Design a binder for these strands. Sequence first.
DNA 1: GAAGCCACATCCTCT
DNA 2: AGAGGATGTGGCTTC
Lengths: 130, 119, 118
Amino acid sequence: PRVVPDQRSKFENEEFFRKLSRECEIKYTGFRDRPHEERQTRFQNACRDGRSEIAFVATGTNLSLQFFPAPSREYVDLEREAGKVYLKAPMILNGVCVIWKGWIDLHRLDGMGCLEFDEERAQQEDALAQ
Amino acid sequence: MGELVRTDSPNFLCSVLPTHWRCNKTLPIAFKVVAKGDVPDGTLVTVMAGNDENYSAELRNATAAMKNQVARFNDLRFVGRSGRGKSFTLTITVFTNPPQVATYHRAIKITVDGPREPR
Amino acid sequence: PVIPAAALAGYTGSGPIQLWQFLLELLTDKSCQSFISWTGDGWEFKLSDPDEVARRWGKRKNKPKMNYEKLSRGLRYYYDKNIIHKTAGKRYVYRFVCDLQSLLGYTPEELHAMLDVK
DNA sequence: GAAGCCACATCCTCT
DNA sequence: AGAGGATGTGGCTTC
């Protein structure tokens, strides 16, 4: 059971998801015990590799991100704005296909992000489960 | 082999964690993550933690590899603290394609002292 | 008591005095130079008689069983906190690596002269 | 007062 | 001699 039957309802009912729908505050959880300098490089360089560690500060919910479809270009943006970095990554959260989406300041190492149901992946997954 | 508990994901279970423990102290029972559905041996599993007081707790040995549906963490420890009367929300991530993540709210409270008898 | 070492270190009386503040208090007392003193190199010092220092530490903390073995374990805890470091290769020699000049208001050269460190 | 945070105090294992 | 891990203890503060 990789997913829950009522996958569609789960995302529009449970507070867990509803609270992570708006442009919540996000932040890079990587190497907090290291100089801000090293954290900046580590975060960017890893983003170039299609991975990072961001958590919704507000609720403290951590997430390990992998910017790839089910090095990228549309999943990890670096042109949409100087300094800012728009990321995107799919995954199965608590049995619900979703897509993480947000940006981060290459200097402040924080920003906003949110989750949004994945009609496509959800569908495919539900079929494999039957 | 032991006593497992269900996580917020329908595909994963995990061993039982003490409700209160001392930071940086080895756990009474090795933490384990067990997959319901078939998961490839060698698949990496990681664990993170945080809440409203600490958005990301410092952890030690938070990485393990799946073997026969079981990811056995060797000496996982919690360094960061959750705050007075507060617990951590665990985020378990199984790196498959795509990655599967299972959370676990109010999993464990971590303080400097840990459990202590009255004074 | 050339200067109020413990006081300048941050000790106001609130709770027990800290080991490093205690050592500083001994290093600023001419009568204690027989068992503990500055080496003349910055804030480097050596316990010429570790047993004696341990005894006083225990007495000051009301821990009769206190001995050098345990006192030094307290010193080793300062390594990561960058308060005191060990001078490698020199028996019972340590060094304050925190900003003592700001705390004390005196430079090592001045303090060594005020204490007539020979 | 309980429950946190601190700075050790004790005890040990290893080089 | 010295480094550093494991865990208990009393002082003090905050909830």
